Structures are given as structure tokens and as C-alpha cells.
Design a binder for this molecule. Structure first.
Ligand SMILES: [Zn+2]
Length: 166
């Protein structure tokens, strides 16, 4: 599992994608014009990811046409409420949609685990790809975000919600 990295510039700042032949491991935000990945080439999960992010930001209308790379981060290798949460979020909530913590909890098999769900969100190694930014309060409020409220709001405004891009 030899780690490979590449960085990509985005409207959110520099993104560091890391992965192996078996799958994308992480997307990390290091902090108007589409940019290329600093290092071109494989492994495949990294090319898929970079292609996916470029579309998400600059070609959103076509986001569904891009394959979601295979994930190989430790959290996905073994079972856990955290994995079940991340996967459920990944496969269910799409571009423009939001979900409350309670709905995600129930979706993961336990309606009373909204808190554990909120916790599982901080353990997401691949933000944006796995839309933890779409998990919001049932009150209508945006809610907490591991990467800062401002980023969460940007992503949401980016997907159509009536919030100004901070
Ligand atoms: Zn790996």
C-alpha cells in the first residue's frame, strides 16, 4: 500500500489527494479557473478523483457521469458504525440534497444515534466526495462542520441552497 499524492487547486484552496492502487485514501484541504492536478498519472483512483473534483466544482451539471473512485482508507477496510454511516451518506444523498443527522442515524440503523453520526462525520477521510457537508440540522440551521462553517456554507450555496458563498 505505497501512498501516492497529488495536489489540486480549487475554489476552496489547495486539495491534497492521497491514494494507492487499491483506492483513494484521503482528500485534504490544505487551505473561478479550473486547475490541473500538480502530478498527472496513476494510480487510477487518484485520476478518477481529480476528474471527479474538477467536475464537481466546474462542471456540476455532469457530476453524476463521473465514477466514484474505490476507497481504501483504513476506515473502509473494516466494519463499524462509522463506515456504515459514511457509505450510507455516500450512496444516498446526492448533489443538491441535504439530510438531517437523525435521518442519517435512522438510515444507518439507529434512529437514536444522531450524536454518533455527527461523530462519524469528523472521521470522514474523503470530504465532498462523501458529502458530509449535506448533513444539516432538522432546525434548518447549517450545523457544525469539521472543516469550518464557512466551507460548509460555500458547498451548500454551490449546490443551490439560499446561502451566500462565504
Ligand atoms: Zn491503500
Amino acid at each position: 500500500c505505497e501512498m501516492k499524492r497529488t495536489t489540486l487547486d480549487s475554489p476552496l484552496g489547495k486539495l491534497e489527494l492521497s491514494g494507492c492502487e487499491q483506492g483513494l485514501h484521503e482528500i485534504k484541504l490544505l487551505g473561478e479557473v479550473p486547475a490541473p492536478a500538480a502530478v498527472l498519472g496513476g494510480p487510477e483512483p487518484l485520476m478518477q478523483c481529480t476528474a471527479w473534483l474538477n467536475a464537481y466544482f466546474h462542471q456540476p451539471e455532469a457530476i453524476e457521469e463521473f465514477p466514484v473512485p474505490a476507497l481504501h482508507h483504513p476506515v473502509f477496510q473494516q466494519e463499524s458504525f462509522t463506515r456504515q454511516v459514511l457509505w450510507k451518506l455516500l450512496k444516498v444523498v446526492k448533489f443538491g440534497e441535504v439530510i438531517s443527522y437523525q435521518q442519517l442515524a435512522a438510515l444507518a440503523g439507529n434512529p437514536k444515534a444522531a450524536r454518533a453520526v455527527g461523530g462519524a462525520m469528523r472521521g470522514n477521510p474523503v470530504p465532498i466526495l462523501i458529502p458530509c457537508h449535506r448533513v444539516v440540522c432538522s432546525s434548518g440551521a447549517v450545523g457544525n462542520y469539521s472543516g469550518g462553517l464557512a466551507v460548509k456554507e460555500w458547498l451548500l450555496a454551490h449546490e443551490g441552497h439560499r446561502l451566500g458563498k462565504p
